[PDB]
């Protein structure tokens, strides 16, 4: 979208970042599709008389869905290692 | 197709509303589709009925008895547009994270208020390399029962 | 007698951005219609379940396309024109590169004022037919205001 | 069964022949309720104040769409006692003539 | 012998909103069919699992074309009526500019009486076709009144 | 006058492994176009709910398609090129094989330097007509760099 | 369907009433197709030898799905008001 | 209370009552109604000897 005129004819449009280390991860994955796709959640409470008070939303969270085409083996396994990181955001 | 004439009392122009500020609110928010769902539930078992009594008697009662038995459900909206801006999306997405947040969306003639967003989708997609399909619903939190 | 011909008539393109000045279109191609649009259809019919009928509004483009003869300054312009993404300029509550075009058809008069669009498809290269005459060049704009006619 | 005083078109109380008041029912009462809700503006309500029509902000001021003043007509029409809906609603716009017509289908 | 000729067809075109008094089409295409009207079909089969067969009604809208010569005063009429929203105009249980086309085909005396529809689709600007000359403009109406037919 | 003409038109196609120093194609085919490229689709239009008009960009290759005379020694290199597999090659940030066309259209230099682009689909065996005369056969690339044209 | 020869070129198809004071209401809707789907349920019972014995059968409530078109902002109004009626059949 | 006998091309479903019934109006069959029924079997025909 617009917000921000790069005025560079070499912007990277996907980053996977590891938060710590601050490094590029699977720098080569060939991206197709993202959704970003948000949720929440409401407290419909019928009360008496016809009405619904909706008390309350929670926040619940994110997810992103990518579709790639991994082109490299090395890329698989880093994917792979991704999937298998349970100690890094 | 001059879709700067719109009419003057069904106006086709979305209006999202904010109800602290009274200030329109995500501008240049180009809308695809809106649908408006409003449910309700009515009873599901047999009601009884007293019958061999007289006429207007049974009516006021069984007037009773339907407003006793049907329950509201609250409004809810579903927009589909297509943000052209970060802006426009970055104040949608903090927005939609602020747990307090009551709009009143204003479509072509549909004036529903006290609105709390529930569901944001932003599609990205290699066929709109610039701005993005975006999917917003929207549930009314509370009726707007008028304040004496 | 009616006068259909088409001779005399030109293009003045003016680009919000691209070409603030505008340019001119008068060399049309000699293979491909110089213009064609299609047809409009600003309205719309449903059967109710009685046999009746109902009629409403719908959205309606005009996909107008224009074609060029090959090489000439005309096509060279109308390919900087496609070839310009719409990511590369700033934002207003219009249409990036809002771009019009004024037709002065015929000696007459006829004056259209077609607005409010952008330019859809064209050819990026320049194709060269069996015969060994390089084809016609059709680029298609879209747009959202047809009024404007005079005479 | 909703009861109202005769009231005249200068929204003064209208007294009888023999100087009485005329306590009007129903039908009349209704009608004269509507057209006196409809004759208030926003904000004179010292216990309602969010009741009243838009007189200022949403009708006599350079306003881009005319839905917000047909739904303050409507809630004005709407807060009357048994009126339960308005059939038609009509928001005409002539040279500087803002023309209003109600269809309201109260229950009397 | 038995005479099919179109010509001396006119037609009146007469409209809610946009022509109270309505306007005349005389001046027909040259390439375009005048008049082209698409298979009416009011009628319906479904087959029983005996084999047998069963007749019904269904919904069946008349498609009427009619095609005009480009720049004359019928085809501004017509883009005057394509050119006209339902949204800008005041409602009844009739149809939201409800024209009717009073067609009188050759001087015999058949006059049909169309009526009870709308304009759907129509050319919004000329199209200059590879011989140079503007191609006739075709307007397709869209009816549920088909009844009306004399001699 | 313009001059459209074909004739003294060259290809020069390099690829980063295959042909690394790249080939020349110059002998075209006589029954099929010699270069013939899919109308470019580089922007997109979509319809709000008030019946305006909202113009973004989308993805778009542009389709090549060259042909040349069934046996001659282009036909053979192409042929060389349709038959090496992606996955037989190293791997880089860029694509598998970027293979670029430098078209030199006529004396008048046009350069178009199509680049960031692979082969897609051509015949392996050459067909034989009713005739009895191999027709010519057809090779399309596709590209995503379509910018350097000059003149 | 047939079962009345009315011989009028003018009957109203679809209709509304109101039950109480017997008017119409929404008489500008232009409707498109209605569905009244009906229900019930049986109450298999599986007993000793193989065999189901259905017992008794209860009469679900009736619904009606109508799609309709409704041309002006004072019919919207309407049905919005005939959601809300909670106290007429 | 509603027992029937339902004879297809050659069976003989016996002791059937209607489930769901279903009435479709659409504007492609002004006449006639598109009617889709289900059916179920209250008791097997156990021969009462």
Redesign the interface.
Known sequence: MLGIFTSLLSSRSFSIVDQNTNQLVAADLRISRVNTRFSSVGQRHMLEDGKTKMDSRTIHPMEIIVEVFCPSIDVVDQINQLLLDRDTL | ???F???????????IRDDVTKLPVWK?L?????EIY?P?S???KPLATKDQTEAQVY?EA??ID??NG?????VRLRINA??????T??SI?NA??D?TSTFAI?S????ADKM?????????????????EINMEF?????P???? | MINVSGFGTGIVIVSASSFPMGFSLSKFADDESPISSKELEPFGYEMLYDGGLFAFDKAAPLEVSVSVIAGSEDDINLRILLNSKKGSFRFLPGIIPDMTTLVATLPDGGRTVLSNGTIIKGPAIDTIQNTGRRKGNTYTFVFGSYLGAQT | STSTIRTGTNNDILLDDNGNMVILRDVEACAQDVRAAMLMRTGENIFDVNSGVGYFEYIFSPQKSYDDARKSIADAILSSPDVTGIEQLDIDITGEVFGVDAKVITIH
Chains 1, 7 share one sequence.
């Open positions: 197709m001059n879709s004439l719109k009419s003057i009392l069904n106006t086709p122009t979305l209006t240049s180009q809308v695809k589709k809106v409003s309700a009515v009873v599901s009516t069984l007037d339907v407003k049907k329950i509201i459900q609250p297509i943000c052209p801006d970060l802006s999306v970055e997405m939609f994270n747990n204003t072509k003639s549909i004036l709390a967003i529930m569901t944001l989708d932003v599609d990205q997609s290699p066929d709109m390399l610039n701005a993005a549930e009314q939190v509370e009726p029962v008028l304040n004496e």
